[PDB]
Design an enzyme around this catalytic site. Structure first.
Site, PDB file in Angstrom:
ATOM      1  N   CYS A  29     -38.031  39.133 -15.826  1.00 50.50           N
ATOM      2  CA  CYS A  29     -38.473  39.061 -14.436  1.00 50.50           C
ATOM      3  C   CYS A  29     -38.118  40.365 -13.735  1.00 50.50           C
ATOM      4  CB  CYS A  29     -37.810  37.893 -13.713  1.00 50.50           C
ATOM      5  SG  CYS A  29     -38.140  37.754 -11.891  1.00 50.50           S
ATOM      6  N   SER A  79     -36.824  40.711 -10.938  1.00 51.83           N
ATOM      7  CA  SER A  79     -35.496  40.609 -10.349  1.00 51.83           C
ATOM      8  C   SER A  79     -34.362  41.110 -11.281  1.00 51.83           C
ATOM      9  CB  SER A  79     -35.209  39.207  -9.846  1.00 51.83           C
ATOM     10  OG  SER A  79     -36.139  38.814  -8.854  1.00 51.83           O
ATOM     11  N   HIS A 125     -34.322  44.697 -10.954  1.00 52.09           N
ATOM     12  CA  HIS A 125     -33.676  45.122  -9.694  1.00 52.09           C
ATOM     13  C   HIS A 125     -32.153  45.310  -9.868  1.00 52.09           C
ATOM     14  CE1 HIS A 125     -37.345  44.584  -7.628  1.00 52.09           C
ATOM     15  NE2 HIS A 125     -37.161  43.383  -7.111  1.00 52.09           N
ATOM     16  N   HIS A 183     -32.247  35.240 -15.938  1.00 48.30           N
ATOM     17  CA  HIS A 183     -32.249  33.975 -15.191  1.00 48.30           C
ATOM     18  C   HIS A 183     -33.438  33.081 -15.426  1.00 48.30           C
ATOM     19  CE1 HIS A 183     -34.532  36.880 -12.831  1.00 48.30           C
ATOM     20  NE2 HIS A 183     -35.144  35.847 -12.289  1.00 48.30           N
ATOM     21  N   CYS A 227     -38.318  30.634 -13.517  1.00 47.05           N
ATOM     22  CA  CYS A 227     -38.448  31.556 -12.382  1.00 47.05           C
ATOM     23  C   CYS A 227     -39.882  31.818 -11.981  1.00 47.05           C
ATOM     24  CB  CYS A 227     -37.700  32.898 -12.532  1.00 47.05           C
ATOM     25  SG  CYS A 227     -37.811  33.793 -10.977  1.00 47.05           S
TER      26      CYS A 227
HETATM   27  N1  LIG Z   1     -38.385  34.740  -4.119  1.00 50.69           N
HETATM   28  C1  LIG Z   1     -38.093  34.416  -5.399  1.00 50.69           C
HETATM   29  O1  LIG Z   1     -37.531  33.350  -5.728  1.00 50.69           O
HETATM   30  C2  LIG Z   1     -38.468  35.445  -6.423  1.00 50.69           C
HETATM   31  C3  LIG Z   1     -38.645  34.950  -7.850  1.00 50.69           C
HETATM   32  C4  LIG Z   1     -39.209  35.820  -8.743  1.00 50.69           C
HETATM   33  C5  LIG Z   1     -39.407  37.065  -8.397  1.00 50.69           C
HETATM   34  N2  LIG Z   1     -39.142  37.577  -7.054  1.00 50.69           N
HETATM   35  C6  LIG Z   1     -39.463  38.968  -6.682  1.00 50.69           C
HETATM   36  O2  LIG Z   1     -40.870  39.054  -6.543  1.00 50.69           O
HETATM   37  C7  LIG Z   1     -41.357  40.368  -6.848  1.00 50.69           C
HETATM   38  C8  LIG Z   1     -42.446  40.319  -7.948  1.00 50.69           C
HETATM   39  O3  LIG Z   1     -41.810  39.985  -9.202  1.00 50.69           O
HETATM   40  P1  LIG Z   1     -42.681  40.149 -10.529  1.00 50.69           P
HETATM   41  O4  LIG Z   1     -44.031  39.545 -10.349  1.00 50.69           O
HETATM   42  O5  LIG Z   1     -41.752  39.769 -11.639  1.00 50.69           O
HETATM   43  O6  LIG Z   1     -42.837  41.734 -10.489  1.00 50.69           O
HETATM   44  P2  LIG Z   1     -43.846  42.728 -11.172  1.00 50.69           P
HETATM   45  O7  LIG Z   1     -44.447  42.195 -12.421  1.00 50.69           O
HETATM   46  O8  LIG Z   1     -43.278  44.126 -11.121  1.00 50.69           O
HETATM   47  O9  LIG Z   1     -45.090  42.734 -10.163  1.00 50.69           O
HETATM   48  C9  LIG Z   1     -45.132  43.523  -8.969  1.00 50.69           C
HETATM   49  C10 LIG Z   1     -46.517  44.046  -8.763  1.00 50.69           C
HETATM   50  O10 LIG Z   1     -46.507  44.714  -7.503  1.00 50.69           O
HETATM   51  C11 LIG Z   1     -47.339  45.873  -7.604  1.00 50.69           C
HETATM   52  N3  LIG Z   1     -47.026  46.879  -6.567  1.00 50.69           N
HETATM   53  C12 LIG Z   1     -45.997  47.755  -6.497  1.00 50.69           C
HETATM   54  N4  LIG Z   1     -46.079  48.477  -5.387  1.00 50.69           N
HETATM   55  C13 LIG Z   1     -47.176  48.035  -4.671  1.00 50.69           C
HETATM   56  C14 LIG Z   1     -47.784  48.388  -3.477  1.00 50.69           C
HETATM   57  N5  LIG Z   1     -47.263  49.343  -2.715  1.00 50.69           N
HETATM   58  N6  LIG Z   1     -48.881  47.742  -3.112  1.00 50.69           N
HETATM   59  C15 LIG Z   1     -49.463  46.754  -3.847  1.00 50.69           C
HETATM   60  N7  LIG Z   1     -48.928  46.406  -5.050  1.00 50.69           N
HETATM   61  C16 LIG Z   1     -47.787  47.029  -5.438  1.00 50.69           C
HETATM   62  C17 LIG Z   1     -47.124  46.381  -9.030  1.00 50.69           C
HETATM   63  O11 LIG Z   1     -48.226  47.197  -9.468  1.00 50.69           O
HETATM   64  C18 LIG Z   1     -46.981  45.065  -9.809  1.00 50.69           C
HETATM   65  O12 LIG Z   1     -48.210  44.631 -10.379  1.00 50.69           O
HETATM   66  C19 LIG Z   1     -40.091  41.196  -7.206  1.00 50.69           C
HETATM   67  O13 LIG Z   1     -39.498  41.807  -6.040  1.00 50.69           O
HETATM   68  C20 LIG Z   1     -39.130  40.110  -7.633  1.00 50.69           C
HETATM   69  O14 LIG Z   1     -37.740  40.439  -7.495  1.00 50.69           O
HETATM   70  C21 LIG Z   1     -38.641  36.683  -6.166  1.00 50.69           C
HETATM   71  O1  LIG Z   2     -36.276  36.331  -9.304  1.00 55.31           O
HETATM   72  C1  LIG Z   2     -35.452  35.397  -8.684  1.00 55.31           C
HETATM   73  C2  LIG Z   2     -34.407  36.079  -7.858  1.00 55.31           C
HETATM   74  C3  LIG Z   2     -34.495  36.118  -6.465  1.00 55.31           C
HETATM   75  F1  LIG Z   2     -35.519  35.565  -5.785  1.00 55.31           F
HETATM   76  C4  LIG Z   2     -33.534  36.754  -5.731  1.00 55.31           C
HETATM   77  F2  LIG Z   2     -33.605  36.777  -4.388  1.00 55.31           F
HETATM   78  C5  LIG Z   2     -32.439  37.346  -6.351  1.00 55.31           C
HETATM   79  F3  LIG Z   2     -31.498  37.939  -5.593  1.00 55.31           F
HETATM   80  C6  LIG Z   2     -32.318  37.340  -7.723  1.00 55.31           C
HETATM   81  F4  LIG Z   2     -31.258  37.947  -8.292  1.00 55.31           F
HETATM   82  C7  LIG Z   2     -33.302  36.696  -8.471  1.00 55.31           C
HETATM   83  F5  LIG Z   2     -33.212  36.699  -9.800  1.00 55.31           F
HETATM   84 ZN   LIG Z   3     -36.917  35.887 -11.177  1.00 53.41          ZN
END
Ligand SMILES: NC(=O)c1ccc[n+]([C@@H]2O[C@H](COP(=O)([O-])OP(=O)([O-])OC[C@H]3O[C@@H](n4cnc5c(N)[nH+]cnc54)[C@H](O)[C@@H]3O)[C@@H](O)[C@H]2O)c1
Ligand SMILES: OCc1c(F)c(F)c(F)c(F)c1F
Ligand SMILES: [Zn+2]
Ligand SMILES: NC(=O)c1ccc[n+]([C@@H]2O[C@H](COP(=O)([O-])OP(=O)([O-])OC[C@H]3O[C@@H](n4cnc5c(N)[nH+]cnc54)[C@H](O)[C@@H]3O)[C@@H](O)[C@H]2O)c1
Ligand SMILES: OCc1c(F)c(F)c(F)c(F)c1F
Ligand SMILES: [Zn+2]
Ligand SMILES: [Zn+2]
Ligand SMILES: [Zn+2]
Lengths: 374, 374
Positions: free
Chosen positions: B46, B48, B51, B67, B174
């Site tokens: 993921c 995250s 990150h 996770h 996730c």
């Molecule tokens: N809230 C939650 O519970 C939760 C759970 C899972 C992931 N997340 C977060 O969600 C985000 C996406 O996760 P993911 O899908 O695994 O990531 P990922 O696979 O990197 O997808 C992100 C996408 O965003 C695109 N991107 C980057 N910059 C831009 C921009 N400026 N404009 C438009 N598109 C852009 C990029 O090309 C990629 O396809 C990350 O920040 C994760 O940390 C949060």
């Molecule tokens: O991707 C799920 C996920 C989150 F949404 C968070 F906000 C975070 F801090 C983290 F560590 C995480 F794994």
């Molecule tokens: Zn996640």
């Protein structure tokens, strides 16, 4: 016999920011197609009118302000179908055209014909009905209620009960409806919940009214003026707090008081900092914060989006989320049936001619609502 | 037998930010009371987790991250009632204690026992089960799935269908549940609505799946990487747009496309600018925007609260709003009942020992989900 004719009457013209209103003669054109000319009976002094004076709210000057009011139809233009001469009416600062995507949406009320987002200070046709000293004077939110007569578009007026007491129900035109709707309609306050209300003026008191009506168990009134607390308790605040009394920031205080954050918080002041504090003080996973206060023109707030990521909901609304023309007559009918009270909001009454004294009372912290009578 | 004994096994240790994972031998203590030791079967990569590597997310190091996973219970501590040795399980990076104010609330899912807000990188008891080269190693979100064995608190694990394919359902831990729930549960996307999804990785594709499932009429996928568009359309995007193709800001483009703004927008990237752009592109009176992406540590965004005052709703959520322990087994059952697909998210399947190569695939733009198999 004034129908079709220009009317000369007194209005309160604002020529310049940060100056008293000038009570002087204006000329009020007759209504064009789909327009309504109204003899004003009562108008309230809302803090948003003061924002026009202070430059907090930018709208074209010179202007006839006023947006919280009630009066009696003097004449109607061609094609008007929803009010008649002699009807009691409330001008609607948020129009309800009934045709646009927002008007057709079950929840939305911020009709696309509004003059709030990008104010022109005109009628719907981009022109003014007001002349003063031979010069055109802007309208305000399509209402311009600080005048013995105004002209409004049909979509900006609602017919109300003929037996309505205009000197009370004018508050349904902004402060009461805004505050009460913010609680019952926008936030959807639940039975047994804990609410925090920032700002205990006319609108914040109305939010408290709405929270108590929705069955909130605890309602915290927050104000830096402790003189506002007695009335807030009268209308349903269970505890009042003054941020000045505490060493800790008030979001921390309120979090402690609510055993981990409130269910619903309301910003009813108009400050960027209290908008963020109000968001922070609602419970991080499921809390809801509603922005009611009007912020200073063109200024952005700064905040950490982790406040939202945890699960908070942040929203704002105009006029309590009410579809204006549908809702105002119903609210009047409900007032006439004693479903809510307006007197707790009215602290002062003055003739229209003492409008400046009315603004002084608001600015001093002494009044809630002053109602001006024409 | 391994029960009651330390296990020596292979894990991917992150000793410091911005370095490769070190695949090496670690010691995994047996579970204490109310703890569960799990033999890992499959774990997803993921963003995250990335990150943590990049410093976007701050959590104590050294750490065993991961996770999004599934495995099989090896042993249980005293007092465990919800899982048994041999059970298929999914670790819950958002716990469900069942006792706190959030767990008791009908909507809330961000259990107060979480290790996300103020990360300690430990078990609930404030200690670690992991050592490597004689040094204690931190946990990550109470899960730490980048290891052949992990130990989790009981409130951070759910029993799932014995017949589940773990190499697919790990995604329910996730990315899938987050995206899907963000649409169906948090936004509550409606039939016939127009949706915009910023970011078309694993999570954004899952948001699309949810929007389509909720009956959205139009779903705009927004990404700067046009290679992501084909898969977005496969899973339900009706139009894809790359902001780099346009002279105007994309919020303006999307507002034009949607004849005045979208019903629902989702930020699924983790940038402050796109959070504000996502908010702005939803319709001003009734639009809803949901923040899903994780932003860089300790940075604030700047926004004009008039975007809210007109009527917009802004919210965020962790794990799609799902109460984790109640929801994960039902999501797995629904998957086994063919209610949704997971294969469209899986672009690569690699052995665990290629964890670094899998992160490189994510970083290069080339993968959606890489599943690592133990
Ligand atoms: N809230 C939650 O519970 C939760 C759970 C899972 C992931 N997340 C977060 O969600 C985000 C996406 O996760 P993911 O899908 O695994 O990531 P990922 O696979 O990197 O997808 C992100 C996408 O965003 C695109 N991107 C980057 N910059 C831009 C921009 N400026 N404009 C438009 N598109 C852009 C990029 O090309 C990629 O396809 C990350 O920040 C994760 O940390 C949060
Ligand atoms: O991707 C799920 C996920 C989150 F949404 C968070 F906000 C975070 F801090 C983290 F560590 C995480 F794994
Ligand atoms: Zn996640
Ligand atoms: N959203 C709408 O449709 C709508 C309608 C009506 C009024 N408004 C706005 O709502 C706000 C309140 O209007 P009103 O009730 O007439 O005004 P008001 O009577 O001035 O009330 C504001 C209250 O806030 C208190 N206050 C000022 N600063 C602080 C502070 N830092 N901390 C805590 N309390 C403080 C103050 O003492 C006063 O009692 C104004 O910004 C209006 O422009 C919005
Ligand atoms: O008090 C109501 C009110 C508002 F809520 C505004 F946002 C605004 F711009 C304005 F002029 C106004 F009168
Ligand atoms: Zn309309
Ligand atoms: Zn007002
Ligand atoms: Zn809990």
């Amino acid at each position: 016999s004034t129908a079709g004719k220009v009317i000369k009457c007194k209005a309160a013209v604002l020529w310049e920011e940060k100056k008293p209103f000038s009570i002087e003669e204006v000329e009020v054109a007759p209504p064009k197609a789909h327009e309504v000319r109204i003899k004003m009976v009562a108008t309230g002094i809302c803090r948003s009118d003061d924002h026009v004076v202070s430059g907090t709210l930018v709208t074209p000057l010179p202007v006839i302000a006023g947006h919280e009011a009630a009066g009696i139809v003097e004449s109607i233009g061609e094609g008007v179908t929803t009010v008649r001469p002699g009807d009691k009416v409330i001008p609607l600062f948020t129009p309800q055209c009934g045709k646009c995507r927002v008007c057709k949406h079950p929840e939305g009320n911020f009709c696309l014909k509004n003059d709030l987002s990008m104010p022109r200070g005109t009628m719907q046709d981009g022109t003014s009905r007001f002349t003063c000293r031979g010069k055109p004077i802007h309208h305000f939110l399509g209402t311009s209620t600080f005048s013995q007569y105004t002209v409004v578009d049909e979509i900006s007026v609602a017919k109300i009960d003929a037996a309505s007491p205009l000197e009370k129900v004018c508050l349904i035109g902004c402060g009461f409806s805004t505050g009460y709707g913010s609680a019952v309609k926008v936030a959807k306050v639940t039975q047994g919940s804990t609410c925090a209300v920032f700002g205990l003026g006319g609108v914040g008191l109305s939010v408290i009214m709405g929270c108590k009506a929705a069955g909130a168990a605890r309602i915290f009134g927050v104000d830096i003026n402790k003189d506002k607390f007695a009335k807030a308790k009268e209308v349903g605040a269970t505890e009042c707090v003054n941020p000045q009394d505490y060493k800790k920031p008030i979001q921390e205080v309120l979090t402690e008081m609510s055993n981990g954050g409130v269910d619903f918080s309301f910003e009813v002041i108009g400050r960027l900092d209290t908008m963020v504090t109000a968001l922070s003080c609602c419970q991080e996973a499921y809390g809801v914060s509603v922005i009611v206060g009007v912020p200073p023109d063109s200024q952005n707030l700064s905040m950490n989006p982790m406040l939202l990521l945890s699960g908070r909901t942040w929203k704002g609304a105009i006029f309590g989320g009410f579809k204006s023309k549908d809702s105002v007559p119903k609210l009047v009918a409900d007032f006439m049936a004693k479903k809510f009270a307006l007197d707790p909001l009215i602290t002062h009454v003055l003739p229209f001619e003492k409008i400046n004294e009315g603004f002084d009372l608001l600015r001093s912290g002494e009044s809630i609502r002053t109602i001006l009578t024409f």
